Design an enzyme around this catalytic site. Structure first.
Site, PDB file in Angstrom:
ATOM      1  N   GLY D  30     -38.686 -14.363  -1.057  1.00  0.00           N
ATOM      2  CA  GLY D  30     -37.643 -15.060  -1.787  1.00  0.00           C
ATOM      3  C   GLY D  30     -37.705 -16.591  -1.759  1.00  0.00           C
ATOM      4  N   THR D  31     -36.711 -17.216  -2.385  1.00  0.00           N
ATOM      5  CA  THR D  31     -36.700 -18.657  -2.520  1.00  0.00           C
ATOM      6  C   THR D  31     -36.115 -19.231  -1.250  1.00  0.00           C
ATOM      7  OG1 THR D  31     -34.540 -19.314  -3.433  1.00  0.00           O
ATOM      8  CG2 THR D  31     -36.117 -18.355  -5.023  1.00  0.00           C
ATOM      9  N   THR D  32     -36.205 -20.547  -1.132  1.00  0.00           N
ATOM     10  CA  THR D  32     -35.856 -21.229   0.090  1.00  0.00           C
ATOM     11  C   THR D  32     -34.369 -21.532   0.127  1.00  0.00           C
ATOM     12  OG1 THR D  32     -38.032 -22.361  -0.094  1.00  0.00           O
ATOM     13  CG2 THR D  32     -36.462 -23.082   1.690  1.00  0.00           C
ATOM     14  N   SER D  75     -31.750 -15.680   1.157  1.00  0.00           N
ATOM     15  CA  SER D  75     -33.085 -15.623   0.526  1.00  0.00           C
ATOM     16  C   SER D  75     -33.536 -14.184   0.513  1.00  0.00           C
ATOM     17  CB  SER D  75     -34.088 -16.418   1.347  1.00  0.00           C
ATOM     18  OG  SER D  75     -33.718 -17.775   1.484  1.00  0.00           O
TER      19      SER D  75
END
Ligand code: MG
Ligand code: MG
Ligand code: MG
Ligand code: MG
Ligand code: MG
Ligand code: MG
Ligand code: MG
Ligand code: MG
Ligand code: MG
Ligand code: MG
Lengths: 244, 242, 242, 244, 196, 248, 102, 232, 241
Positions: D30-32, D75
């Site tokens: 996932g994204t930060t 995330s």
């Protein structure tokens, strides 16, 4: 999920047999043989215990012969523990019939319900069948002395004489040859024991390795008596058949 | 073999999932030990804080279960907390129903019976933990009771849990062979803590600052943990005997 | 193996795809919609000559203005029929009116994907989808005469003419040819016979195929064999002509 | 044996639960997203990747609020995160309905902890595919927590997770050392913007929108609020100049 | 209540049961049969609250029919009556009790005796040579006590009954519109063609 | 979500029920326990197997009172035993004492245990218990008795027997020594010998657990005044009482 | 005892013309000897060219009107935006009412 | 290969849920539909798919309330479940709170609904994608729902076979259409153009085209048949 | 709680648990039914592969459902009992609510439906059973003979057979039953039934049981002696010419 661990106990093989029943029957084939023989004036139940030590307490033992009722008994072959479940629900079915109708329960009626129970384990709920076969001996006044058998499939059938458990092919043959209908009860007693002498995988047949029972309308009064023989009574009967 | 994946018997009569759960207990690489005084019970546990971003004060494998009972856990924190909460709940419900404070050994027995169930039922997994309960019981005196994923439990004179459990245990066995008694002969809990840390430094061959340990103490009618400072006091006292 | 509600990597439900193979194997059924009504025909396919073929009911009434034909495992359809009847009657109890054919069909299709292992309720589910398709034919005042094909995927399509079962593939290329706006009912009856006679293994007769229609004026009626026989003959004559 | 990784409640022989381990991959992927504790509050920030110019800017809000005083950000699998907050909100409401006082942050951490750990107990369910960073201001000051698919959680000075987690963790380790005295809320906001911009450089390939929120005793009044308008701009500026 | 009588003579059992059904102010019908045959040699008559009486009888009936088919056999009158008593005894502690009283007359083929059973809505059962429900006993028991002999023929039984119905016509405020009479004997169940 | 509504013990093609067999294997691996029946008493006995010398073995009861006149002992997995003891004590109350106002007789209580065991052999989602129990008791109409209960649910009465590791050896050893005129003191003597073969560590009152079903003990009743309530027939021996007898 | 009913009435009147229909009601809402509102309308348009009024206890009347309108809206969803004929509406309302027969 | 795709409760070692990914594949195989909005209106346009030349064109647009509705691509019955579930939430909001339900919230509800099926044994996930448009208290809105649970707010988009065309066109058309305020028909023509970069071997008829629009002073309404000749 | 789906589709479109159920029927003893001008006769074979069999108490293969309808079967015997109990109960209930006995068609339809349900519900396997159901409707003299099978499909037959070797006795009847001139006597119809079994049983009335259903609930089983006449007498015709 958990359907990975489910060995599906209620399915058909491609031949249309029920795996688990067949396998339970296999199991039963290694149990002590049991025998029922019906005379015109009574019934005999005889069975072989699983080889029992010398230290085992044979007076209080009741591995294969059980009273359902004042007028009906069974001989078991297979898992004792599974059977005692079934025995007990049957003792209750009898009591319910008796309480509803104020009449002792007819033998078939009881046998049918108990067989219907086993059948259910064979068609729903994913549990394993009961590893038990039963010989039922009883008296009612619609059909007098009666003898039946049931197995894990739920099937039941009636017999003049029959065996379950070990070596039934052998034992069935030997009865088939020697049974006659006019047969008296003491004839049946003798025949029952001959058959187990021949049939047993153990090299002798001795009192401490048997359970034995009769259902007599004998003697004087029209009432019915159930007798489960003790060790000493069985020893006497063995001398008296010169099997010892 | 699925006799490996769920809690049923292998052909040797074994529950591999139970065995593998024991193995998980050591994932934290923490050793713990407990001992008994004249009228206290002490538990000591290593405390490791690998990360510089953690709030250190939140990092603990010791729980105040009730007013009187402390529990230390060997194993992963999620399972530790799940067992903690459960025991808190049980100890409180016991009090409400029966009118007295739940005893250590009885709570241990209960928690063990819960574990036993996961070994017999299939949809439940064992917890990867070993619980050590301590109190000063009003009937039994200072007591230590330990539970594992088998569902096993027993009382102890003293005990130790973790990877280096063996070292610590043999060290203590030796001490009591000499001393001839089943407890630290000490009036003050401050010295039973000192004993415990000492007999641990010698078994692990390793030195401790004040942030390397956690301590818990059970006196009659209270179980409490120490702060880095009440610990520091103890480490200074130990150093005064070089 | 793998659960009954799973998708294939093509994004299709295995059990439903296989359902459709059962349907390709069943007797044949044909429907043709016109402005004077809608006709429904079926291959009966007796399994032996002792079988009393009256007893083969692959065309059923649902309400006076709605009929049904089926191909596949036909036992599966008895309860889809029950639901549909119940829905039509129920609608009319609540609204003092005939249910729309569209709505009735949508109702039946809602059953189709309610199968699974799921849990627990709200409702229990069928173990598998239905192994049967239906042509549903009717009239309502809103959209006139109407033919629907209702499959076990839950979708349903309207058709001017349609064929299902073992014939369908060719039977359909044949309908594509023959059908236009202006078919009289009688043209349509003969068509259905023409196409059944073609795709049936057996030689067509009034005992092994059966016909029905539904008109606003007279509702849905199955035709007797005597009426059908006289249309079989009628067609025989036009076959003599080229 | 093999396949210790197919079922969810199962221990491998080394003591591990491979399905939880695989859920961590869904998170790493996932994204930060990050959390920074200042010395009277906390700050959350998160990288929103811009798939296309057709996204509406401002409007796909990924930080969620619980009760009035708690922020969560996560995330990984976004729908799982939302599911987890819905739970968190029931838990906080139940706690507050009974105890009156809004739920204390540690109390609330353990609520999520127990619910997440619960999805590692049974094979009929699947572990959570998110790490969650959350916290707020309770009556004992500020708290920041992070919570893994296993139900592990601890308190943090700062915390990060998703693709960027290592550049962020290194960057946070800086702040801790180069501000031992504590960090003011408004400075922690700007730092958070910087850190997201720094951690974005793992996949510059994609354009991204920044989102920040804060719960601060002095600045927002112990309530959780999103940062927007001028203050948001000012922190994006600080992030641009800190890149060059 | 309506009229429910029964008498067990030597070779049969006679049931007499009032024909009227009245709903408040009108007499709705004067030809109603308050019996159901439960099996070929077992007859049940009944009376009590509206709806309940019939529902209960027709339910008992279907149960005995089910039994007969299943076992290819006809339960004894004693067994039927124990079954019925047990059903009524469940009714009383139920949410809405069946308010129904019954008489069961049967010929027991196995013992070649007729048997009469009286059972009230509480499940109070008793075997009797003659019985009745409600107030019917009050007028007629005097006469039965006097005249009854266990060795009576069916004809004697029917005379003794004729006398009982006369006493009821004379002293009882209600016009119950006569009775229907049935006989249960070794050959089964038949209805007396006329009680003129 | 208990998905597991199906049996985990099923018939193999040969007719075996693997899980019952495997349970028996776990039992066989367990520490030896035994029981023996005299005329005026019964004794049951086993070895305490201290897992550390830091553990307090008194806090592990391997021998348990089930009712004042009935005790038990086991070989196999102790946790499974612990919960069967809890269960058995409860069933003695709910399904007997609460009805008839007296404690169940030995064989009936054994049925109840057996039954519980059977259920784990057939019900959904469980394994069988990995223990065998020996249960000894006394009741007024059957006198003294001794039963063995197996994972399958099967039980059987014995004059004497043994279960666990050394059991084939010990059963042999008991056959030589058992007669039907044995008095209780003598059976204890034999129990101690038969145990002593099966154990090579320290052998004394701290490493041995032992109970009897004997005369009634009014000193252990707790109250006086009802001449019709005499004490429990069951009694654990003390570390002392045992060593005392290790003279003979 | 809590009494769950009340009376706000209320008078309404409906007349069928031969190609039209009217439905009328006062707009006054009362309790005992008090006025609550001098304008609280009680005749509603429910929109398949159907006007409804439920006079009596105001809360029960409002519940019913709500429920009916919702019924209309769901008839649309469920039957391809079909128009609800007045006789079907009447049947539907018998069912809503009888639903609460007890 | 791939024991990990047997159900939804199983993660792959890389961290994927194969059953969900297989449900997304049903969407790509569905017929194309396009959504877009100005500040005053939002528009769905959909290409319907027939079975034969004798068959109906399966409808792709469903009204959910007066101010909101959607189009589907993929498993149709599934859209029927979800659209129905939504009709209820729109309704519940009206009846209880007397409030038109916001599109953002309908978004969140659909996400949460879909997510349930992807964490529980026995549930398959939904096999349909949806475009939802609504006009609420903050103007025009367009959402894209995927059966993974992700919903994302957009000015425009498309889903179904060959939709990459219509999407690339919308990305380029953006600043043209985003300003078609107070003009229903222009915005539709701009949607229909978009949907064309997506047809392979057939073009728009009266029978296969359906369109819906909603916005300020215009309730969600659907045109098909004669009604759509206008724009074809 | 056990609802595992056991009857499911395989990729060729078949349902193996149902097809396997038919295999159980094929292993079951042969049963046969044939209809007259106004009787229907049901005949079934016994196994004398065992003969200490108490024939008076042992379950018959033909069962009364009501006083005017009978049912026989092939396949799992235990399973048959459950269909029969449900049917008997349905017949008594039908009388109660409609005040008429069941039509044969109705009763057949009921039983088939039960069978079908068990091919489409979790936790259960289908019935290993196939049935013939015969009798007369109320106040009606045209005889009825219906067949059901594990899938739930049912239909009526001029005459029909099921069980081991059914395909042999079907042949025989497929060419010995004239639909234009069905057996006009009982005696005649009983004869055609015994004939068809004798293709497969090949001992005699030891192994055969017959039951004759006539209008107005007139149902009767034959005793082996009277069946024997039908056997012994079938011999004199095959041999001499
Ligand atoms: Mg049972
Ligand atoms: Mg009963
Ligand atoms: Mg209805
Ligand atoms: Mg009672
Ligand atoms: Mg009372
Ligand atoms: Mg005391
Ligand atoms: Mg009022
Ligand atoms: Mg692809
Ligand atoms: Mg009934
Ligand atoms: Mg069912």
């Amino acid at each position: 999920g958990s359907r990975r661990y489910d060995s599906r106990t209620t399915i058909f093989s491609p031949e249309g047999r029920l795996y688990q029943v067949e396998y339970a029957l296999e199991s039963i084939s290694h149990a002590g043989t049991a025998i029922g023989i019906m005379a015109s004036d009574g019934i005999v139940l005889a069975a072989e215990r699983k080889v029992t030590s010398t230290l085992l307490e044979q007076d209080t033992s009741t591995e294969k012969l059980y009273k359902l009722n004042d007028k009906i008994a069974v001989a078991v072959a297979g898992l004792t523990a599974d059977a005692e479940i079934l025995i007990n629900t049957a003792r209750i079915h009898a009591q319910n019939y008796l309480k509803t109708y104020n009449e002792d329960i007819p033998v078939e009626i009881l046998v049918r319900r108990l067989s219907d129970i086993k059948q259910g384990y064979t068609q729903h709920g994913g549990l394993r069948p009961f590893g038990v076969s039963f010989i039922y001996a009883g008296y009612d006044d619609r059909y007098g002395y009666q003898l039946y058998t049931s197995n894990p499939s739920g099937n039941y059938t009636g017999w003049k004489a029959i065996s379950v458990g070990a070596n039934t092919s052998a034992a069935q043959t030997l009865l088939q040859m020697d049974y006659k209908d006019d047969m008296k009860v003491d004839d049946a007693i003798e025949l029952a024991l001959k058959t187990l002498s021949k049939t047993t995988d153990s090299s002798a047949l001795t009192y401490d390795r048997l359970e034995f029972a009769t259902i007599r309308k004998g003697a004087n009064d029209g009432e019915v008596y159930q007798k489960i023989f003790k060790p000493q009574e069985i020893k006497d009967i063995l001398v008296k058949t010169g099997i010892t | 073999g699925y006799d490996r994946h769920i809690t049923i018997f292998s052909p040797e009569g074994r529950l591999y999932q139970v065995e593998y759960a024991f193995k998980a207990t050591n994932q934290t690489n923490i050793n713990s030990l407990a001992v008994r005084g004249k009228d206290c019970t002490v538990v000591i546990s290593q405390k490791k804080v690998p990360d510089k971003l953690l709030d250190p004060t939140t990092v603990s494998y010791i729980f105040c279960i009730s007013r009187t009972i402390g529990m230390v856990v060997n194993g992963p924190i999620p399972d530790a907390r799940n067992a903690a909460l459960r025991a808190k709940a049980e100890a409180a419900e016991f009090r409400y129903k029966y009118g007295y404070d739940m005893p250590c050994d009885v709570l241990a027995k209960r928690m063990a019976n819960l574990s036993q169930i996961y070994t017999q039922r299939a949809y439940m997994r064992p917890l990867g933990v070993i619980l050590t309960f301590v109190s000063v019981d009003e009937e039994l005196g200072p007591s230590i009771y330990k539970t594992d994923p088998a569902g096993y439990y027993v009382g102890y004179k003293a005990t130790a849990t973790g990877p280096k459990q063996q070292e610590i245990t043999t060290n203590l066995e030796n001490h009591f062979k000499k001393s001839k008694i089943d407890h630290i002969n000490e009036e003050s809990w401050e010295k039973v803590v000192e004993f415990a840390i000492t007999h641990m430094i010698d078994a692990l061959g390793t030195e401790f600052s004040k942030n390397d340990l956690e301590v818990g103490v059970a006196t009659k009618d209270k179980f409490f943990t120490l702060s880095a400072e009440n610990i520091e006091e103890r480490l200074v006292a130990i150093a005064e005997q070089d | 193996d793998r659960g009954v509600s799973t998708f294939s990597p093509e994004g299709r439900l295995f059990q439903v795809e296989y359902s459709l193979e059962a349907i390709k194997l069943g007797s044949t059924a044909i429907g043709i919609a016109t402005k004077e009504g809608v006709v429904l025909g079926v291959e009966k396919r007796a399994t032996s000559p002792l079988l009393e073929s009256d007893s083969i009911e692959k065309i059923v009434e649902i309400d006076r203005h709605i009929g049904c034909a089926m191909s596949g495992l036909t036992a599966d359809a008895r309860s889809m029929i029950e639901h549909a009847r119940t829905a039509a009657v129920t609608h009319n109890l609540y609204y003092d009116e005939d249910i729309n054919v569209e709505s009735l069909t949508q109702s039946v299709c809602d059953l189709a994907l309610r199968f699974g292992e799921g849990a627990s309720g709200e409702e229990r589910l069928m173990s598998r989808p239905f192994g049967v398709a239906l042509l549903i034919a009717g009239h309502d005042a809103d959209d006139g005469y109407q033919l629907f094909h209702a499959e076990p995927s839950g979708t349903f399509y309207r058709y001017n003419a349609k064929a299902i079962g073992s014939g369908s593939e060719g039977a359909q290329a044949e309908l594509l040819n023959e059908w236009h706006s202006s078919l009289t009912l009688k043209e349509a009856e003969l068509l259905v016979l023409k196409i059944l006679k073609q795709v049936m293994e057996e030689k067509l007769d009034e005992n092994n195929a059966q016909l029905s229609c539904i008109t606003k004026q007279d509702g849905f009626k199955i035709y007797d064999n005597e009426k059908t026989a006289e249309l079989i003959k009628e067609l025989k004559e036009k076959e003599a002509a080229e | 044996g093999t396949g210790y990784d197919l079922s969810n409640s199962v221990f491998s022989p080394d003591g591990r639960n491979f399905q939880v381990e695989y859920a961590v991959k869904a998170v790493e992927n996932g994204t930060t997203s990050i959390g920074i504790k200042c010395n009277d509050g906390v700050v959350f920030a998160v990288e929103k990747l811009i798939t296309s110019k057709l996204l509406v800017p401002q409007k796909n809000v990924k930080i969620q609020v619980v009760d009035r005083h708690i922020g969560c950000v996560y995330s990984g699998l976004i729908p799982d995160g939302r599911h987890l907050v819905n739970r968190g909100r029931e838990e906080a409401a139940s706690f507050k309905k009974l105890y009156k006082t809004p739920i204390p942050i540690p109390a609330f951490a353990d609520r999520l902890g127990q619910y997440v750990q619960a999805h590692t107990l049974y094979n009929s369910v699947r572990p959570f595919g998110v790490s969650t960073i959350f916290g707020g201001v309770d009556k004992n000051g500020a708290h920041l927590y992070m919570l893994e698919p296993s139900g592990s959680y601890w308190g943090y000075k700062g915390a990060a997770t998703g693709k960027g987690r290592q550049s962020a963790k290194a960057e946070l380790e800086k702040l801790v050392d180069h501000h031992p005295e504590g960090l003011s809320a408004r400075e922690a906001v700007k730092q958070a913007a910087k850190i997201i911009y720094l951690a974005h450089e793992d996949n510059k390939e994609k354009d991204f929108e920044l989102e920040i929120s804060w719960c601060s005793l002095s600045e927002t009044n112990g309530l959780h609020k999103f940062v927007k308008g001028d203050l948001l701009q000012e922190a994006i500026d600080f992030a641009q100049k800190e890149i060059n | 209540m309506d009229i429910i009588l029964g008498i067990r003579v030597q070779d049969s059992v006679i049931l007499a049961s009032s024909k009227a059904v009245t709903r408040g102010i009108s007499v709705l019908k004067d030809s109603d049969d308050k019996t159901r045959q439960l099996s070929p040699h077992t007859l049940m008559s009944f009376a009590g609250e509206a709806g309940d009486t019939v529902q209960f009888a027709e339910y008992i009936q279907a149960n005995i029919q089910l039994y007969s088919i299943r076992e290819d056999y006809e339960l004894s009158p004693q067994a039927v009556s124990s079954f019925v008593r047990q059903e009524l005894a469940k009714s009383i502690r139920s949410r809405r009790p069946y308010q129904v009283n019954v008489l069961i007359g049967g010929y027991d083929k196995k013992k070649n005796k007729p048997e009469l059973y009286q059972i009230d809505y509480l499940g109070t059962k008793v075997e009797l040579p003659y019985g009745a429900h409600g107030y019917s006993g009050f007028y007629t028991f005097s006469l039965l006590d006097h005249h009854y002999r266990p060795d009576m023929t069916t004809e004697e039984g029917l005379d003794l009954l004729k006398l009982c119905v006369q006493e009821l016509e004379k002293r009882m405020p209600m016009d119950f519109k006569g009775v229907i009479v049935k006989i249960v004997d070794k050959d089964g169940i038949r209805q007396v063609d006329d009680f003129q | 979500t208990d998905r597991y509504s199906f049996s985990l013990t099923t018939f193999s093609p040969s007719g075996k029920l693997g899980q019952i067999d495997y349970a028996l294997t776990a039992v066989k691996q367990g520490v030896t326990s035994l029981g023996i029946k005299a005329t005026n008493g019964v004794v049951i006995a086993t070895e305490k197997k201290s897992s550390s010398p830091l553990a307090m073995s008194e806090t592990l009861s391997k021998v348990s009172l089930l009712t004042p006149d009935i005790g038990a002992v086991y070989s196999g997995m102790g946790p499974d035993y612990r919960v069967l003891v809890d269960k058995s004590r409860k069933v003695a109350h709910t399904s007997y004492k609460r009805i008839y106002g007296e404690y169940p007789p030995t064989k009936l209580l054994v049925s109840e245990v057996a039954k519980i065991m059977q259920e784990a052999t057939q019900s959904g989602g469980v394994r069988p218990f990995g223990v065998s129990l020996l249960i000894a008791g006394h009741d007024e109409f059957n006198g003294f008795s001794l039963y063995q209960v197996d994972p399958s649910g099967s039980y059987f009465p014995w004059k004497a027997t043994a279960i666990g590791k050394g059991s084939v050896a010990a059963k042999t050893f008991l056959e030589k020594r058992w007669n039907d005129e044995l008095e209780l003191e003598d059976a204890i003597h034999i129990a101690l010998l038969t145990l002593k073969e099966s154990v090579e560590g320290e052998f004394n009152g701290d490493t041995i657990e032992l109970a009897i079903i004997g005369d009634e003990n009014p000193d252990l009743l707790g109250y006086t005044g009802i001449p019709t309530d005499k004490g429990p027939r069951f009694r654990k021996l003390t570390s002392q009482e045992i060593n005392d007898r290790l003279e003979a | 005892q809590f009494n769950p009913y009340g009376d706000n009435g209320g008078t309404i009147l409906g007349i069928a013309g031969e190609d039209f229909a009217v439905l009328a009601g006062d707009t006054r809402n009362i309790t005992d000897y008090s006025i609550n509102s001098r304008y609280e309308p009680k005749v509603f348009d429910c929109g398949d060219n159907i006007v409804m009024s439920a006079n009596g206890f105001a809360a029960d009347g409002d519940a019913l009107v709500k429920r009916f309108k919702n019924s209309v809206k769901w008839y649309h969803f469920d039957h391809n935006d079909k128009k609800l004929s007045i006789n079907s509406a009447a049947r539907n309302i018998q069912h809503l009412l009888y639903g609460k027969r007890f | 290969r791939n024991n990990y795709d047997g159900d939804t409760v199983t993660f792959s070692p890389t961290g994927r849920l194969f059953q969900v990914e297989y449900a997304l594949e049903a969407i790509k195989q569905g017929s194309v539909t396009v959504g877009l909005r100005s500040n005053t209106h939002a528009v769905l346009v959909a290409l319907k798919r027939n079975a034969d030349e004798l068959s109906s064109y399966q409808k792709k647009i469903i009204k959910c309330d007066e101010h909101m509705g959607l189009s589907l691509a993929g498993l149709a019955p599934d859209a029927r479940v979800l659209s129905n579930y939504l009709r209820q939430q729109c309704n519940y909001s009206s009846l209880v709170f007397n409030r038109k339900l916001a599109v953002e919230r309908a978004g969140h509800l659909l996400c949460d609904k879909a997510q349930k099926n992807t964490q529980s044994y026995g549930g398959r996930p939904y096999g349909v994608g949806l475009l939802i448009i609504g006009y609420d208290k903050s103007g025009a809105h367009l959402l894209e729902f995927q059966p993974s649970g992700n919903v994302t707010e957009l000015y425009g988009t498309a889903i179904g076979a060959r939709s990459q065309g219509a999407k690339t066109y919308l990305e380029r058309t953006l600043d043209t259409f985003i300003k078609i305020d107070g003009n229903p028909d222009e915005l539709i023509k701009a949607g229909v153009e978009a949907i064309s970069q997506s047809l392979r071997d057939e073009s728009l008829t009266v029978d296969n085209l359906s369109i819906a629009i909603v916005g300020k002073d215009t309730p969600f309404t659907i045109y098909d048949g004669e009604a759509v000749a206008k724009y074809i | 709680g056990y609802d595992r789906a056991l009857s499911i589709f395989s990729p060729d479109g078949h349902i193996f648990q149902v097809e396997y159920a038919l295999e159980a029927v094929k292993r079951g003893t042969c049963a046969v039914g044939v209809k007259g001008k106004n009787c229907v006769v049901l005949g079934c074979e016994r196994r004398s592969t065992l003969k200490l069999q108490d024939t008076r108490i042992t379950p018959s293969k033909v069962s009364k459902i009501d006083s005017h309808v009978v049912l026989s079967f092939s396949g799992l015997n235990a399973d048959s009992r459950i269909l029969i109990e449900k049917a008997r109960v349905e017949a008594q209930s039908h009388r109660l609510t409609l005040e008429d006995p069941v039509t044969v068609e109705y009763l057949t339809r009921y039983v088939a439906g039960v069978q079908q349900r068990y091919t489409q519900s979790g936790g259960v396997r289908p019935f290993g059973v196939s049935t013939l159901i015969a009798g007369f409707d109320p106040r009606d003299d045209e005889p009825k003979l219906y067949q059901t099978e594990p899938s739930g499909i049912y239909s009526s037959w001029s005459a029909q057979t099921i069980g081991r070797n059914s395909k042999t006795v079907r042949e025989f009847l497929e060419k010995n039953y004239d639909r234009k001139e069905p057996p006009a006597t009982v005696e005649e119809c009983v004869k055609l039934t015994v004939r068809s079994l004798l293709e497969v049983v090949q001992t005699g009335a030891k192994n055969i049981e017959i039951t004759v259903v006539k209008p107005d609930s007139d149902i009767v089983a034959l005793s082996s002696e009277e069946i024997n006449q039908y056997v012994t007498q079938i011999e004199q015709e095959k041999q001499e010419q």
